[PDB]
Amino acid sequence: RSIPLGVIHNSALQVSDVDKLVCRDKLSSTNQLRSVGLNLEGNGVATDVPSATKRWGFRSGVPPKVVNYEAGEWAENCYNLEIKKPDGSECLPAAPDGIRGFPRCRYVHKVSGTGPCAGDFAFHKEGAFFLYDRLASTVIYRGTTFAEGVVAFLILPQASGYYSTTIRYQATGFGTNETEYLFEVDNLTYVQLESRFTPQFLLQLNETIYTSGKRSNTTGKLIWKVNPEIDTTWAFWETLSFTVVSXXXXXXX
Amino acid sequence: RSIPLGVIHNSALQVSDVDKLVCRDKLSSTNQLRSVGLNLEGNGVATDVPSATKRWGFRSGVPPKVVNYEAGEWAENCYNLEIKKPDGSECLPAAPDGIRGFPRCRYVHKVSGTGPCAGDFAFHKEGAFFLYDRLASTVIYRGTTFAEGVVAFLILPQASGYYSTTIRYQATGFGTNETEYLFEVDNLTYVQLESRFTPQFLLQLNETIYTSGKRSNTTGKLIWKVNPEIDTTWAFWETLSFTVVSXXXXXXX
């Protein structure tokens, strides 16, 4: 298949190619050609860490491929993965030279933990790309922030503030059907994570935990659980008390 | 010298260049341009391991160079080299990232052994290339299957089953005038190798050795020798009893 090219005709975006243009179409400079990365976010996909990770999977025998893109979209949700095997060996390769994190992320979901990782590289199960800094890869690199997305190619017609917040999670059984996630409050206080939980709810609950003083006050690990009664939540652009009952389990009602 | 380009004119292949075409010649797409790797095999060169290795030599001071090619020829004979120095250090460099073995080899002649290796890289003494997976290199990489060949560039006019067998050899004095080769039957049974021996003869003799039960049945190394009386053999596309007499020497009459 020939790689499609976007062209504006009759006040609408058309898919075409350079072999299918008419003499009136004018290309006077390579500046008129542009590559754009668009975020899966903008098509309405679930962005919570549980939903997002199930779109990725390990596979051997397929060499990684990288394609550049010149312009991108600000992301609400990005991901940054540090996954090892139970024996402690790395599941993802170090970022190759010159590959940097995606440059505009409102929330960086940083996931550390373990899984079997039954394959040499982690690919997108839907054929999408992992978008880094103006480089789109078929595979995930270790510890390197990315947005899920896809790339478009265009013929142009010739003519505030950046904040970012890292949300940390721990995971077991990563990349399987029995994966479990914990939202990290400090190194000893965690909240059991649900797909329902938005970033701002997580940041809210984190803040209430610190201020109300419900962090672990022990050597041991304190895991909070949020029972279904309370509401947490629509796409991003269009929009209590705690008791211990024991590791140390508890409940936020 | 300008790189020649193949063009069809008057029902014959012509060597030309883009600066030497006439207006009737039409190039309407980069798809009409193609690079092809052709195998030295197809020009009639001896392909036995002794003859083939004497076409390669070590040299320092010349940086390796790689050129891609898009299409190739199925090979009868490929080679895969694991050569070290007597002190055990590697003679050939590891395959760079993204360089894989030649994809279509009826016979992979896998040679392990030692030589002096008096140079940083192994080059083709006749100026040919080592063909890998759609990449042609001036030098040999360690443990990476290749075919010897050359590359052509063409302007096109605009319009079964794969089996592979690994034959293993051991070598001493590799890359010199006093190189000696052994065909490997198992890790303790070897046949002294002659240039006369075709792949199918080697596979035949191997099979007869197993079935007749003339493998080494000891801790020690059994080397069989084939005296000149018997016939073994023309290019590939147009076409007993054993006694010990001793390491342990013997003879296949």
Added chain:
Amino acid sequence: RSIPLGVIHNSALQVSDVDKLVCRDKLSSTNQLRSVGLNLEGNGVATDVPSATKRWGFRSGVPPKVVNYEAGEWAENCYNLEIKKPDGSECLPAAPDGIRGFPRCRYVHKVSGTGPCAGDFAFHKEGAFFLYDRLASTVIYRGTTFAEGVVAFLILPQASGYYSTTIRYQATGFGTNETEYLFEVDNLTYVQLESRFTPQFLLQLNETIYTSGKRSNTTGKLIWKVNPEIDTTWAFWETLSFTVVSXXXXXXX
């Protein structure tokens, strides 16, 4: 800014671009396009090691970039840096694969020593490039001979002996305001270096030291000093007795 292109018109060199040419301008081959590296030397900059090193500085956060160039100028002065931190760790990265020293250097000023190196890479403070073998880099590589220079791009109109001498120096406080340099005569005899000292004066003084026999004749370090009375010196293309008085200090009057 668009990258300027040099074009000959009216018997003079003009700066233009492909978007600003007239139909009479003819480009019939990519051979007519050429990149040239020109040496800062040729604009009259001081080339002595003290003056040259103060044009370079360490900086973090800026990825290195490399651009090729096809043709270069013979240099009188090149530099080759082996700088470590006081704790012995390397300040400069190893030369990437395929990056070799500048190919034509009358004098290679080889500097070894220490500095704080407060940044990941050493850049040119004036925005110039470090010219290597047909590759121009924004940063300095360890132990790799370079000339300082800049690159030009040209549309052409369609139509002895090489000697090199290594001068070795040692440095402390490299890359600061309190840097000190020593010219190396042997591993135990050094001359305190001034910006005034030309290469040929250094080679002359070295020769006189050997012949007069004023090298260190001890286990210890002998440092000679040259008081201002004597003359040493204009650009390169247009043109005694010693007494000890002590490490071991001395004076060349």
Added chain:
Amino acid sequence: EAIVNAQPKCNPNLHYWTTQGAAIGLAWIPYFGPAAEGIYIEGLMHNQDGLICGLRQLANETTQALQLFLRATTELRTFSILNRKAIDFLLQRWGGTCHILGPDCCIEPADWTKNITDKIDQIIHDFV
């Protein structure tokens, strides 16, 4: 073909980032200029002519051909797609003989008909 967005949703605004231009003082010198994080400009495009929602669908539909292209190349990192498109554009229009007034031939002799239609009033204008 015209592009039909068939996604579950569409964010109709494109808050984009890209790289730039006319520098200020010494800011073009790598030693003095921005770090990797600070080379980006930002802008906002709204969905006039449905171009943003169309663009999202276009990127989505491009993926198959792009991935098949990446599968078949041996370059580890591909930077040449747009340059090759530019070459193929030129080869389409100028890769063969351009037959004037043919449909695949982009030369207009409109004025140069007029320049010789004015030259019908040349000789048998003044045919005294």
Added chain:
Amino acid sequence: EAIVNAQPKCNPNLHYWTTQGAAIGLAWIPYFGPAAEGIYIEGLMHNQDGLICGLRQLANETTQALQLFLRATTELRTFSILNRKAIDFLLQRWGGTCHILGPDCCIEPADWTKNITDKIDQIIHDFV
């Protein structure tokens, strides 16, 4: 020049492999698709017009110029030879002013002679 095979032998048939196209289902998704070993298509070409034996000689004779090109470049891996040929093809035909009916100028006004040869029957056709 025409190409003269001067090899000891020639295999007149080209059993070739290359990469491909219209995928089946999810096979274009790298996660689900073939491994490196399974991306190849095969074909067989016979020696019609002597093209196979000529091709072998052509590849052989290309080697000197190719090697000299590789010696002089500093790219570790060269992918741009064919793209540069395409550019040089265009520069040869269109790099300067195209003088119509000149030998180095690929514009045919054959029909556009006819369109104004029909226009000789315009005014002194009907010169009443």
Added chain:
Amino acid sequence: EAIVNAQPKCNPNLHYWTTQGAAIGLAWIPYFGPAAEGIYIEGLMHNQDGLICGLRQLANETTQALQLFLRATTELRTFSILNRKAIDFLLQRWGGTCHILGPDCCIEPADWTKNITDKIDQIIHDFV
């Protein structure tokens, strides 16, 4: 613009090195040919038409735009600048419809005016 050298000094002679061509015997075979140090040819150009001093100023003035280009690309090593210039040259002249006798259109019908100015002596030459 014309180029004004504004450097402290100018070396008016360019003692240059570059890579080459017609080889001697086996010297094109990498195994037998020169080492990295021995692939260079040399020449000497003097300052006729002030081209050398102009070239030094040109390289100097190119640096800002070049550095800004390098800042914005993600290629570690850039080899494509001249090839892209060649493409942009072609797109400037041939990227749209070429209106004959327009100022941005490089086709000369000088002879092809003569070929039909000779053809005014075709029919009412011999209008017997």
